[PDB]
């Protein structure tokens, strides 16, 4: 599923991400835009052999099991394919664990390079929330 901007904002808000660990909703929407272009089915292979999955490009090296990343962990305790569903619940719960682990949203390279320090509220402007 390819979400619309406000559709995704509303789904993320319902799942508890607005101001989660101090990150306003616009941060999460911005991160999703530049990580996946709002596409739940996005995958990208990394040089170390891990793969990023889903709307928030969650990495198989630490967070989910895809059966092809030797020596990796599965800290969200999910198959990585669960992160590609049109239902973002799995991705959101896993993202909550990630953002709590210490480095906050810096875990997402696109957020660090393209959202951090910008007017992120613009990503939810106009939406009925
Ligand atoms: Cl915001
Ligand atoms: Cl772009
Ligand atoms: Cl594996
Ligand atoms: Cl933080
Ligand atoms: Na893994």
UniProtKB/Swiss-Prot annotation:
Class in the EC hierarchy, top level: hydrolase
Assembly information from the UniProt record: Monomer.
Catalysed transformations (reactions): Hydrolysis of (1->4)-beta-linkages between N-acetylmuramic acid and N-acetyl-D-glucosamine residues in a peptidoglycan and between N-acetyl-D-glucosamine residues in chitodextrins
Recorded family membership: Belongs to the glycosyl hydrolase 22 family.
Cystine residue pairs: 6-127, 30-115, 64-80, 76-94
Active site: 35, 52
Subcellular localization, as worded in the UniProt entry: Secreted
Keyword Signal: yes
Known tissue expression: In the egg white and polymorphonuclear leukocytes.
Keyword hit for Transcription regulation: no
Its EC number(s): 3.2.1.17
UniProt keyword terms in alphabetical order: Allergen, Antimicrobial, Bacteriolytic enzyme, Disulfide bond, Glycosidase, Hydrolase, Secreted, Signal
PANTHER family the UniProt entry points to: LYSOZYME C
More info: Lysozyme C is capable of both hydrolysis and transglycosylation; it also shows a slight esterase activity. It acts rapidly on both peptide-substituted and unsubstituted peptidoglycan, and slowly on chitin oligosaccharides.
One GO molecular-function entry: beta-N-acetylglucosaminidase activity
Domain C-type lysozyme: 1-129
Role this protein plays: Lysozymes have primarily a bacteriolytic function; those in tissues and body fluids are associated with the monocyte-macrophage system and enhance the activity of immunoagents. Has bacteriolytic activity against M.luteus.
Binding site for substrate: 101
InterPro entries, per database record: Glyco_hydro_22 (IPR001916), Glyco_hydro_22_CS (IPR019799), Glyco_hydro_22_lys (IPR000974), Lysozyme-like_dom_sf (IPR023346)
The name this protein goes by in its record: Lysozyme C
GO cellular component, one term: extracellular space
Pfam families, A to Z: Lys (PF00062)
GO biological process: cell wall macromolecule catabolic process; defense response to bacterium; defense response to Gram-negative bacterium; defense response to Gram-positive bacterium; killing of cells of another organism
